[PDB]
């Protein structure tokens, strides 16, 4: 909005940007009545009394070809008074700062949802740079033409008289509070805005001109950053050599920085990870077979890079970032920093594969920072509230004590700041290792919501072994088929009252989470399958799997890589495998039981813990959510 003060003493000169509201003040400097006459290019909506509440608004149809090429003449008059004119010389210009605010096709507010508005900005956190180590957004150069594919286009369209920028100048700027989070390049690329440059005078010729910019974000939404970046163009009147520049017009574009998003087990797999180059090759054969069946790329981290760290699940989580112009996978690199420390940075980050990390990197970390403790539900609607990308799930204690663990707060805060998968804390700290993947998994299903929640279940396994005993198999041996292990009979397992007490307490820990998941994910019992599973309490009364933890499985669409439990063999078959098959095969799932005993199981993890998976991003666009 602008209010131009017109005067009979002096003619006034003014610029009018198309799309702006221009009013006249006729009264303040008048000498009883007035009339207005203007050139055809000016539409004056409002003969009239010289009264202060008379709203006179000027509208201009097109950009001026010359400065002052439109005129307004206000003739004041009275009963005995010959007319007195005031002159206003107008120059109209077009100043449009443009971005993809409809989110398909290149107010000043970023709004969520399908009817919303606001452009998207990607954190430029991959490495298209040929033989480099850094993320692309770390320097202030565009070093590759394909890097620009990651960036957001913004264009300044101007239409002015040929001499307009003799006396006016345009400046592009970003608030100092946001300059550290964005970098803007001008294309014909050189930086115009960025971490030490909050403003830049644009060099723009008169007439019609179009100037393209490319914008990269430098930081993910976080505690300290809601995720919005505003870029502003200001038109400055520099007509007076003995006076400071005066702002004539400002316009803005607001971008939202795209969140980091995880993919549930119900998303189709694209690539499997194992770092199974260590001591054993038959585990690796099985997962390789499964990957083939599932049509996945397969990548393996060798012993020389492993440093004997076999837990491919724990050091990273492969998510993605998504904009209308570009979607790419992005590895969240856990601070756990064991043998696999370098793998995400050296082997997973690369062209069109982004990187993020959080938390302290040389200590101050726990087991619950391992990303076996970081999972995500399938899409879910909870008491009317839709969660179309699911809800992040991570394990905690039920209350903080001297002996309890949590995922580091920096990680927790980063996940919640990616508002999109509204995290839910579960209770995993009762486990020795402490990971949600030790008691839950999700698998696809053809009916009802499209998945099942699988939970480890001591109840189910006691039921199974009791039925087997009732049918005369009390002598059948748990751990049949194992070289070096105490074989144990079903009857002695059942009669062990301390084992029963242990598993009763575990059942209680899992049941707490069952009801938590039910509330927070809106699940019914019909969404849930119990997988027969025994545990034992050991050091600090922390729970460990009694036999291979079958819930800690690899889910490759309908192909499942389930730890081989080595259960009692009844009518030629392990009754545990048999039970699991009877539960999952009716869903169309194919269960492969993988020997992981002396390589994973014995070192406190199973198939899921020794592998990782990159999965297809959701088709649903995160910005269409209303978090």
């Amino acid at each position: 909005g602008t209010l131009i003060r017109v005067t009979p003493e002096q003619p006034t000169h003014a610029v009018c940007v198309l799309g702006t509201l221009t009013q006249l003040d006729i009264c303040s400097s008048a000498p009883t009545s007035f009339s207005i006459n203007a050139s055809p290019g000016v539409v004056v909506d409002i003969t009239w009394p010289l009264d202060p509440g008379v709203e006179v608004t000027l509208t201009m149809k097109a950009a001026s070809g010359s400065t002052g090429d439109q005129k307004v003449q206000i003739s004041y008059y009275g009963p005995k008074t010959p007319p007195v004119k005031a002159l206003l010389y107008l120059t109209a210009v077009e100043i449009s700062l443009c971005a993809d605010i409809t989110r398909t096709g290149k107010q000043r507010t970023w709004t969520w949802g399908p009817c919303g508005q606001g452009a998207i900005l990607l954190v430029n956190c991959d490495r298209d740079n040929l033989e480099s180590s850094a993320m692309d957004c770390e320097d202030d150069e565009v070093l590759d033409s394909e890097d620009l594919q990651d960036m957001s286009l913004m264009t300044l369209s101007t239409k002015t008289p040929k001499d307009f920028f003799t006396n006016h100048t345009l400046v592009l700027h970003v608030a100092r509070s946001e300059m550290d989070k964005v970098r803007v390049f001008q294309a014909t690329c050189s930086v115009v805005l960025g971490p030490k440059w909050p403003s830049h005078y644009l060099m723009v010729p008169g007439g019609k001109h179009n100037m393209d910019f490319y914008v990269e974000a430098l930081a993910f939404p976080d505690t300290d950053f809601p995720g919005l970046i505003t870029l502003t163009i200001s038109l400055l009147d520099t007509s007076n050599l003995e006076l400071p520049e005066a702002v004539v017009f400002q316009d803005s574009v607001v971008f939202r920085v795209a969140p980091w998003i995880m993919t549930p087990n119900t998303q189709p797999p694209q690539e499997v990870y194992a770092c199974s180059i260590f001591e054993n090759e038959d585990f690796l054969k099985s997962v390789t077979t499964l990957a083939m069946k599932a049509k996945c790329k397969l990548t393996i981290c060798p012993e020389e890079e492993n440093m004997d760290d076999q837990w491919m699940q724990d050091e990273m989580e492969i998510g993605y970032i998504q904009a209308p112009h570009k979607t790419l996978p992005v590895v969240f690199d856990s601070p756990r920093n064991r043998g696999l420390k370098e793998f995400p940075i050296k082997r997973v980050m690369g062209p069109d594969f982004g990187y993020v990390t959080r938390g302290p990197q040389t200590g101050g970390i726990s087991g619950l920072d391992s990303f076996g403790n970081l999972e995500v539900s399938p899409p879910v609607t909870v008491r009317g509230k839709e969660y179309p990308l699911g809800r992040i799930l991570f394990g905690d204690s039920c209350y903080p004590s001297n002996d309890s663990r949590q995922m580091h707060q920096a990680l927790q805060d980063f996940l919640s700041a990616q508002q999109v998968q509204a995290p839910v804390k579960l209770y995993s700290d009762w486990l020795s290792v402490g990971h949600v993947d030790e008691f839950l998994s999700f698998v696809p299903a053809p009916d009802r919501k499209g998945f099942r929640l699988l939970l480890a279940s001591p109840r189910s396994c006691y039921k199974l072994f009791q039925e087997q005993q009732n049918e005369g198999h009390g002598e059948a041996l748990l751990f049949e088929g194992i070289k070096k292990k105490k074989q144990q009979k079903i009857k002695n397992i059942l009669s062990n009252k301390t084992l029963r007490e242990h598993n009763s307490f575990v059942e209680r820990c899992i049941d707490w989470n069952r009801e938590l998941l039910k509330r927070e994910l809106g699940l019914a019992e019909s969404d849930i399958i119990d997988i027969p599973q025994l545990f034992k309490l050991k050091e600090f009364s922390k729970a460990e799997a009694f036999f291979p933890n079958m819930v800690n499985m690899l889910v490759l669409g309908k192909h499942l890589g389930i730890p081989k439990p080595f259960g009692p063999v009844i009518n030629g078959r392990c009754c545990l495998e048999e039970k699991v098959c009877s539960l999952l095969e009716p869903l169309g799932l194919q269960c492969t039981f993988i020997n992981d005993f002396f390589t994973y199981h014995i070192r406190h993890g199973e198939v899921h813990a020794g592998t990782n998976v990159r999965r297809k991003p959701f088709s649903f666009k995160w910005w269409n959510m209303v978090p």
């Binding site: 043998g339 290792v433 070192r603 993890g605």
Partner: peptide
């Protein structure tokens, strides 16, 4: 290489 430490 225990999963825990």
């Amino acid at each position: 290489a225990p999963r825990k430490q």
